[PDB]
Every structure is written in C-alpha cells, then in structure tokens.
Design a binder for this molecule. Sequence first.
Ligand SMILES: *[C@@H]1O[C@H](CO)[C@@H](O[C@@H]2O[C@H](CO)[C@@H](O)[C@H](O)[C@H]2NC(C)=O)[C@H](O)[C@H]1NC(C)=O
Ligand SMILES: *[C@@H]1O[C@H](CO)[C@@H](O)[C@H](O)[C@H]1NC(C)=O
Ligand SMILES: *[C@@H]1O[C@H](CO)[C@@H](O)[C@H](O)[C@H]1NC(C)=O
Ligand SMILES: *[C@@H]1O[C@H](CO)[C@@H](O)[C@H](O)[C@H]1NC(C)=O
Ligand SMILES: *[C@@H]1O[C@H](CO)[C@@H](O)[C@H](O)[C@H]1NC(C)=O
Lengths: 91, 182
Amino acid sequence: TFLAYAQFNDTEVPLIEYSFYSDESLQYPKTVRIPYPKAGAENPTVKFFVVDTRTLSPNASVTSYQIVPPASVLIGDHYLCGVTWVTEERI
Amino acid sequence: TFLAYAQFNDTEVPLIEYSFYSDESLQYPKTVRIPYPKAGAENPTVKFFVVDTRTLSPNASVTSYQIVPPASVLIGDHYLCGVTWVTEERISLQWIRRAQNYSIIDICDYDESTGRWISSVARQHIEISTTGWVGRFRPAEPHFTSDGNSFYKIISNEEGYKHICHFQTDKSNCTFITKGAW
Ligand SMILES: *[C@@H]1O[C@H](CO)[C@@H](O[C@@H]2O[C@H](CO)[C@@H](O)[C@H](O)[C@H]2NC(C)=O)[C@H](O)[C@H]1NC(C)=O
Ligand SMILES: *[C@@H]1O[C@H](CO)[C@@H](O)[C@H](O)[C@H]1NC(C)=O
Ligand SMILES: *[C@@H]1O[C@H](CO)[C@@H](O)[C@H](O)[C@H]1NC(C)=O
Ligand SMILES: *[C@@H]1O[C@H](CO)[C@@H](O)[C@H](O)[C@H]1NC(C)=O
Ligand SMILES: *[C@@H]1O[C@H](CO)[C@@H](O)[C@H](O)[C@H]1NC(C)=O
C-alpha cells in the first residue's frame, strides 16, 4: 500500500576530488567529485517519507507524510539507520 | 471535507497600463499594470483542484486531485464558469469554450479507493446556442436535489424562452417544468 523512502541532501557536504584516467585514448584526465563528509564535516541531512500509493494518478498530487525522529534525536545531527515494516499500518 | 479552488495563470496575458497620480504629495505618477486580455488577445488559463483537507498536517503534503474539462472543451480555449457542490462526493463543474456558444456540465464522483474525482459521458450535459450565446451573460447554474441524482436549470426552450428544465443527473434528456412567452 505504502512506499517508504528516505531523501538525502548533500548540499552542504564538501567534495572529495580525485583523478580518473580511464582508457589510454582519454586525452585529459577526468575529475571525479563525490559529496563525501570527512570527520567533523557537514554531514548530509535526511528526511523520511511514507507514500500512500493508492491515490497515485497522473492528475493527482502525491500523498506522503514525513516522519520526523523523536525530539531527543531531532535536537541535532542525526542518522536514519533502520526501517522495518511491522504491519500495513505500523512502521 | 474537501476544498476546491481554481488556479489562474496570466503569464501570457498582455498588460494594460495607465497612470495613477495618487495623492498630491506623490512626486512621480505610478504606473498601474494589470494582465487584461482584450478581444482576440491571449487569455489566462485555468486549473481546478479538489483538496482533501482531511490529510492536511504540518509534515504532510497536500493531497489534491485535478479535474480537467471534458474533451469537447479541452480541444481549445475555455473558461471554467461554474462550480456547484452536489454532495461530499459529488461536484458539478460547468465549462464553456472561449466561443461561448457551447458549454458543458461535468458531474464528478469521488472514488474512495483512489481519492480521485471521476467523470463520465453519462453525467455530462451539453447546452448550446445556434443563434447566439449560452445564458443571459453566463450559462445558468444547475440546481441539484438533495441526493444529487437530478437537478433543475434554466435553458432556452424550443420557442427561445428561458425556462426551468429538469435533468436526470445521468441522462441527457430534460423536461421543461415551465413554459410561456415570459
Ligand atoms: C537541501 O538543504 C539545503 C540547505 O543545506 C536547502 O537549502 C535551503 O533552502 C531554503 C528554502 O528553499 C532556503 O531558505 C535556504 O536559504 C537554503 N539554505 C542554503 C544555505 O542553501 C535545500 O532546500 C534542501 N533541498 C531539499 C529539496 O530539501
Ligand atoms: C487527467 O486525466 C484525464 C481523464 O479525465 C485526462 O483526459 C487528462 O489528459 C489527464 N491530464 C493529464 C495528462 O495529467
Ligand atoms: C503558467 O503558464 C506558463 C506558460 O504560459 C507555464 O510555463 C507555467 O509553468 C505556468 N505556471 C503554473 C504554475 O502552472
Ligand atoms: C513536524 O516536523 C518538525 C520538524 O521537521 C517538528 O518540529 C514537528 O514536531 C513535527 N510535527 C509533527 C506534525 O509531527
Ligand atoms: C459557435 O461559434 C463558432 C464561431 O463563431 C461557429 O463556428 C459555431 O458553429 C458556433 N456554434 C453554433 C452552435 O452555432
């Protein structure tokens, strides 16, 4: 019925950059960049969502609710490290 | 339960402009600008949505469905000209071609299992004019019975007089309940 999903925001995460040379024919090396948070750096932020797929239709908005973590955690930087469906109406 | 609203987009509508001098102390006239379409100009477009205000909540998205005009009207420039709530699960939308000698009443039913407002050719009623325009200024509003299975509305009769016809919500023929040269 539902389709839970997390959204990840790397906007303020620094980029690690390194070279990838590739096949000999590649005249200039390619610069690979990954939003990679190193110790103490800005980490990416996260949002969780449960979507009710039943109202999914081209001319219809998306029905979704954002489940925020308990305040003791919402207080500061946090990580979502687990998602377990128990029943169709309990996550 | 539901909140319906129409969205108007004037992006491509030319702007009329004129001076507004305001109070004497104003040293420079301000220029009023209004998106206002003149004959033949580009018209604003419209969209109709039905919000299901039951889901509304701070950390929740707006659950809404868009009802679009029936094909015969979609084909070109149109105007939404009437919105009438029949029942918590039945809403009547009245559209009309930019021409205005052709309007249609589309009666949509809510689908509990999908949250969308469905339409059907059974519940669509056409009104037209071959000698002019529909309605006196705008097509007359339908008046539904408490169960929304039929409705009463004014249209021109065979003699060209505006009288009350009776429509079965899901049948195209209507019956006049009034008649005369008035
Ligand atoms: C990803 O996170 C960034 C912040 O790191 C969000 O950017 C902010 O967006 C709001 C509203 O759009 C602005 O008022 C802020 O000024 C922005 N902050 C900065 C410093 O960029 C961004 O909206 C997030 N993206 C999504 C889709 O969640
Ligand atoms: C919305 O659904 C209607 C069905 O009545 C369809 O005719 C219309 O093209 C759809 N609009 C889109 C493409 O979102
Ligand atoms: C308004 O109409 C323009 C096209 O004229 C379109 O590009 C734009 O996305 C529309 N705006 C909205 C929010 O529907
Ligand atoms: C909604 O989310 C904000 C933070 O994203 C939080 O402050 C608030 O407690 C949440 N309220 C609800 C509807 O649970
Ligand atoms: C509505 O007007 C258009 C152009 O003015 C015309 O082609 C069409 O036949 C008219 N409809 C009727 C019923 O006369």
